[PDB]
Amino acid sequence: MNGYDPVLLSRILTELTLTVHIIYATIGVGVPLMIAIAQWVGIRKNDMHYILLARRWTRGFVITVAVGVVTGTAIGLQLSLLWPNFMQLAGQVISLPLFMETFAFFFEAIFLGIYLYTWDRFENQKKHLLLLIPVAIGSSASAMFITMVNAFMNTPQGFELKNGELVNIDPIVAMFNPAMPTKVAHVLATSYMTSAFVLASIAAWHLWKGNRHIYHRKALHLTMKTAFIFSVASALVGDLSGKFLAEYQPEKLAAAEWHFETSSHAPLILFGTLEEDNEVKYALEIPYALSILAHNHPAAVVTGLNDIPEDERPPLYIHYLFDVMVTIGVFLMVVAAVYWLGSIFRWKWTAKNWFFGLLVAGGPLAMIAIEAGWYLAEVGRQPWILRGYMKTAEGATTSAHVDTMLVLFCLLYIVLVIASATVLIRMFRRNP
């Protein structure tokens, strides 16, 4: 246990770091798009209230960004610290994209800094749109390049194993692996979405309370519609990635959906409770999706989990996360699909609290679904790294350091999150 506790403690710590990282990240990915769009709408419509919401957002986008950065640095450093023997092999292949993430971030950060410090000096709004286009591009460029890491971690290749030593590396084979499309796509969509609901959860808070229809109805009207779109696309690329899994790595998917048994028409599950050792309690399940319109043939035989080695299978507490993520997906898409529809273009239900409440919950629900989703996709992963890559159990280092540094970091992040939330509310209550 002087070199086996860390197998667990490291996992735990890394979760605690990155779990914090993402709160301050998918915002970094989705917000800038939304800002660009707000600017563009303000410009195209000659309505200098959207142009105020662009900056009104940016002014906190900064603080989000910075907290993102420090947690980023944290995880970045923690990477090869907690998992040396991993990077000993794969570092050669991961090195580039990881760099390209932060490079793309600096590239966006320049223009972000320009707009931030030229919108109050130099001329014309288009010339500030042209400064906000590169930003969101660089943001999504981060996600692209960094996700390509996880996509790769999930799947080879671009390498060869000389008795353990990883060589003969092709950049774009490892980068543009089979998972990369669905990861990049689903991550970008479910990050435009999230922030799209997050701004709606401001507009629905401020409009609900001190009903300054002014910005706050326009804000909702836009954010909600875009949120709808992004949730739709998100769900689509969700089905896509699900199919990818069913085809390429059913170990996750069969654990998500508890398909111990291989079958043609295999039902999905809405929620259940199988405690790790076969204890089927709540059982609410529907016939199969990812075959009828995915594979175009309902009787496409889904690989079962029994057919996966029990040293190669991940937990069964994955299902709950699929439940969470998906159901939040659908519910939130429905709320979004109604708002603009029923509450604006039909029976004027906007001013009703029955919406504003749900729309206040909206963003938080999405971020939740994010954490959940990441847990799902990442925790279906633990028992593969130990094989085609290298033993997870032989990836960590020492114990009596990690246990404490974990708690230090825990405290630190606790402070970060709280403080950031506080300041980031204070600003909005100051009304700049």
Binding site: L33, I37, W40, V41, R44, K45, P178, P181, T182, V184, A185, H186, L188, A189, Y192, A196, H221, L222, K225, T226, I229, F230, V232, A233, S234, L236, V237, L240, S241, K243, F244, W340, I344, F345
Partner: peptide, 30 residues
């Protein structure tokens, strides 16, 4: 090939749809 490419497409579509909202039912409506 089609289902390997498709996602990013779906995304790219969702983006410029999300823009198109700003012209359709934002500029010339509500």
């Amino acid at each position: 090939f089609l289902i390997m490419y498709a996602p990013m497409v779906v995304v790219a579509l969702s983006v410029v749809a999300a823009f198109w909202v700003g012209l359709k039912d934002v500029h010339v409506n509500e």
